[PDB]
Amino acid sequence: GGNQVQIKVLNIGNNNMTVHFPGNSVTLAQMSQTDTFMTFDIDKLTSINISSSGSPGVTTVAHDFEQGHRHTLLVWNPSQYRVVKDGLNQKPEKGENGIRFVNTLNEMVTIKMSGKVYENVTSHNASGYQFFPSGEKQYTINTTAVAPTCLTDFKSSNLDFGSAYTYVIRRASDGCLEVKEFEDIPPNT
Amino acid sequence: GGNQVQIKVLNIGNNNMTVHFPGNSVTLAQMSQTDTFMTFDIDKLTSINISSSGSPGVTTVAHDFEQGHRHTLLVWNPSQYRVVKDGLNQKPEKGENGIRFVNTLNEMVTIKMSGKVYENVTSHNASGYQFFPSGEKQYTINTTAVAPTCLTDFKSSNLDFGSAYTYVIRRASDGCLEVKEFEDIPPNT
């Protein structure tokens, strides 16, 4: 996955804190972290609650987790948090192509390509890159910005070896969707 | 560098735009980008102005750029922009150590290590990782959070091969700075 979210918790406060994930709670001492990234299916990550020892305050986490990515959930007293982006769940294989999408529409866009998802790419913003084996890839774009009758199926060009591309999503002259491809110098990250 | 900033410009609007960098101007047609990442010394990146054809509006990029990182400057009509982080300027060599810093102080912190900089890491926040060859590394931490008389020089432990670490910065019992090292699962990107 693809569809899996990896989360590590790092307690940077001065007391014991608990993060309640669906089906599993982790209590950490101050100045300590979970030894591993815990893995979840995005659809099963319904809510995340954070609490502190003694303090009755329970805080719910703003669902800012991207599938296919690792995150560090920073926690501190009194029930404070910050989600830090830690990059991809998997190291891209030699020869894979990095693809990111840029949304120029006034509504969010979701892109699904070869089992990978770029969810709710905001207006005039870029997603991070995700990596794919070479060759033409089919993908879909779903948004409220265009008529439901508009074409949602697209195809990437013949992806070279180890390249990186930015796919810019815009309105076509007929009012539907169009994608312009740009080659970028490969990311080092 | 290290102390270098890489910037590519991508015009995602519907008209011609100009980006004035110190000593060099780039004019882009709609749906076009600069063919390369232009490189600048952070200290020499005094200001960046963005303008559109016909529209008298000139916008200054007050938004920061991180040294040692690549960026995509997204531009669109009338004089809009967004700085997108594209990762590191250099691909980490096999065996290098990814190191990031977490600031738990109430003031921003700046860390300088082996020619690399982590500038203004905000309160209860993490920097991205930067990579270094193996062995003990000397580093400095400068902040307004502690007395100027406090020790600002630190040393990393004898760091292993391909190992990643998070250095958590906190106030020591004597009122000065203290750093706790955590080993991490190495980042993939």
Author numbering:
A (entry chain A), B (entry chain B): 391 to 579
What does the paper say about this structure?
Mammals obtain nitrogen via the uptake of di- and tri-peptides in the gastrointestinal tract through the action of PepT1 and PepT2, which are members of the POT family of proton-coupled oligopeptide transporters. However, a key structural difference exists between bacterial and mammalian homologs with only the latter containing a large extracellular domain, the function of which is currently unknown. Here, we present the crystal structure of the extracellular domain from both PepT1 and PepT2 that reveal two immunoglobulin-like folds connected in tandem, providing structural insight into mammalian peptide transport. Functional and biophysical studies demonstrate that these domains interact with the intestinal protease trypsin, suggesting a role in clustering proteolytic activity to the site of peptide transport in eukaryotic cells.
We subsequently identified the ECD from Mus musculus, consisting of residues 391–580, as being stable and amenable to structural and biophysical analysis. This domain was crystallized and its structure determined using the single anomalous dispersion (SAD) method of phasing using mercury-derivatized protein. The structure was refined to a resolution of 2.1 Å with final Rwork and Rfree of 19.7% and 23.8%, respectively. The crystallographic asymmetric unit of the PepT1ECD crystal contained two monomers that formed a head-to-tail dimer, related by a two-fold non-crystallographic symmetry axis, whereas the PepT2ECD construct was crystallized in a monomeric state. Analytical ultracentrifugation on the purified ECDs show that both PepT1ECD and PepT2ECD are monomers in solution. This led us to suspect that the head-to-tail dimer observed in the asymmetric unit was the result of crystallization and that the physiological state of the ECD in PepT1 is monomeric, as shown for the PepT2ECD. The crystal structures revealed that in the PepT1ECD there exist two conserved salt bridge interactions stabilizing the interface between lobe 1 and lobe 2, mediated by Asp574-Lys398 and Asp476-Arg490, whereas in PepT2ECD only one equivalent salt bridge interaction is present, between Asp505 and Arg538. Consistent with this analysis, 3D envelopes of the ECD generated using DAMMIF show that PepT1ECD forms a compact shape ∼48 Å in length whereas PepT2ECD is more elongated, approximately 61 Å in length. From this panel of potential ligands we observed binding only for the intestinal protease trypsin with both mouse PepT1ECD (KD 80 ± 0.8 μM) and rat PepT2ECD (KD 165 ± 0.5 μM). We identified two highly conserved charged residues, Asp550 and Glu573 in PepT1ECD and Asp576 and Glu599 in PepT2ECD, located on one face of the ECD structure.
